Design a protein around this ligand. Sequence first.
Ligand SMILES: *[C@@H]1O[C@H](CO)[C@@H](O[C@@H]2O[C@H](CO)[C@@H](O)[C@H](O)[C@H]2NC(C)=O)[C@H](O)[C@H]1NC(C)=O
Ligand SMILES: *[C@@H]1O[C@H](CO)[C@@H](O[C@@H]2O[C@H](CO)[C@@H](O)[C@H](O)[C@H]2NC(C)=O)[C@H](O)[C@H]1NC(C)=O
Ligand SMILES: *[C@@H]1O[C@H](CO)[C@@H](O)[C@H](O)[C@H]1NC(C)=O
Ligand SMILES: [Cu+2]
Ligand SMILES: [Cu+2]
Ligand SMILES: [Cu+2]
Ligand SMILES: [Cu+2]
Length: 502
Amino acid sequence: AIGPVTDLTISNADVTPDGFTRAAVVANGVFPGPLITGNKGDNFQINVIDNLTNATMLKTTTIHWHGLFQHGTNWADGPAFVNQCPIASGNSFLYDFTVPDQAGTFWYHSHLSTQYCDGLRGPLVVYDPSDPYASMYDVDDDTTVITLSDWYHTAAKLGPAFPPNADSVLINGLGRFAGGNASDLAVITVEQNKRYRFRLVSLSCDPNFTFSIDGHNMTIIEVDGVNHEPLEVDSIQIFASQRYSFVLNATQSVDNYWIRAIPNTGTIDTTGGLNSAILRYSGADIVDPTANATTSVIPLVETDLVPLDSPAAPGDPVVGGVDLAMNLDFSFNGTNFFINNETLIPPTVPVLLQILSGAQSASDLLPTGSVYTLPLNSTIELSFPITTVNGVTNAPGAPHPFHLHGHAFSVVRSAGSSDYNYVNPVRRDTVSTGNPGDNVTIRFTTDNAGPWFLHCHIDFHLEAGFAIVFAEDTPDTASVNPVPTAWSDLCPTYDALDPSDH
Ligand SMILES: *[C@@H]1O[C@H](CO)[C@@H](O[C@@H]2O[C@H](CO)[C@@H](O)[C@H](O)[C@H]2NC(C)=O)[C@H](O)[C@H]1NC(C)=O
Ligand SMILES: *[C@@H]1O[C@H](CO)[C@@H](O[C@@H]2O[C@H](CO)[C@@H](O)[C@H](O)[C@H]2NC(C)=O)[C@H](O)[C@H]1NC(C)=O
Ligand SMILES: *[C@@H]1O[C@H](CO)[C@@H](O)[C@H](O)[C@H]1NC(C)=O
Ligand SMILES: [Cu+2]
Ligand SMILES: [Cu+2]
Ligand SMILES: [Cu+2]
Ligand SMILES: [Cu+2]
């Protein structure tokens, strides 16, 4: 598609992906936003131009590049009031970062409040010119990126704080709803005998999908950017913001098959052509698939995923055997979520800026009680217990997929299991915290200077303040992250704007 140097033009326009036309916030006119492409070691320069006129979906914007470590470029990370002030309408801003150590599938989405649910979301792929799996597949390009997105007929700010379900599930940006127009479905074409590398992206706001293909199989090689040992899989449970790359061996008779993406919540049912896309072998008739969905006997299990390189998790194999152990006490008061008796209500001055202003200790950072300081070259173990309590159950709205910015973590203990794995646990940038009784525990090493966000990636929870910030190596933040003029120009230019022009 575009990149590695290009412009993202962000504008308000009416779009109709499910048969229903509604105004949205979109990148380069099309939803989901255009595929940004680059190679390992390429220097990305993305000139985000803000041309927004609809106040109700926010005229100001900021884009995060999910899964990209952003070393030396913490300013360019995205999160509003953590890493930068939002870009004003009528202005433009350049995101100038190199990606030297990273190879695989990512995505980019607006990180200002709930804007990305209103449309500002697109896939982002970095390709590896020496990809250890290039002798597995024949095709990998634009028409192999499969984008799963939940879609809403009512706008983010206009509907409830916590939407119960999506109106439609969009595959490659095309799906249907209940009393649906029965309009266009997504069409993925394949040639006989040819291997396909499919890059599966979850641009979801809330629901998690059970992704499956009729009469076929998926061989996962990649989870959330990180290269993993090949896995035999029937169906993939992909939580919000997660990514998977699977190689599909096109070995079945020339026919139309269903590409299925059942969400966990909402209208679960293939009848109507809802939650579906078309897998069409080249030469079969331009009709709807008549294929049926079988039961899953070899489904995706997290604990089964093993990293391709450097599989051992940091820290010695012990519960607590780590430099800094931290446990997150969750709770919910009706409107807002809480981590350690605190909620993230975003400060006037970005967490980053605060450090460049000379702030150092956790006591001096804002918001207070929510910014934790982490020393460098120390190993960190986090744990997300979803508990049933005395009869209360903290953190409803489960399961919650927690994402850590600027790091790829080893998931030593996964949802649904109580065993700990330190020898070769899966390595990813967002993990499901699961259901009550799951003490999901993750480990990662502090190899990145600057402030980083840790939040549930269900965007409606994010807005409820289910988040904390890691001020990782505060003394070196200033120096290790050189800030361009455009970035420092943002906060004085943004605070001048009226709530009307927000
Ligand atoms: C700005 O965007 C909003 C939300 O995207 C639009 O709100 C629509 O308003 C009409 C009448 O109030 C409703 O029937 C629709 O439900 C709203 N859309 C959504 C998605 O909720 C609004 O029309 C926009 N203003 C313009 C004209 O650009
Ligand atoms: C979830 O797991 C963590 C450890 O991985 C538990 O936290 C530790 O629990 C022990 C008691 O077993 C305490 O002495 C430690 O001080 C705890 N670590 C802290 C304070 O970060 C945690 O209790 C588990 N959650 C539950 C209740 O299952
Ligand atoms: C819930 O917490 C939020 C933020 O802390 C607050 O605005 C609201 O007043 C709280 N509701 C209750 C139970 O008082
Ligand atoms: Cu994300
Ligand atoms: Cu991210
Ligand atoms: Cu959540
Ligand atoms: Cu984030």
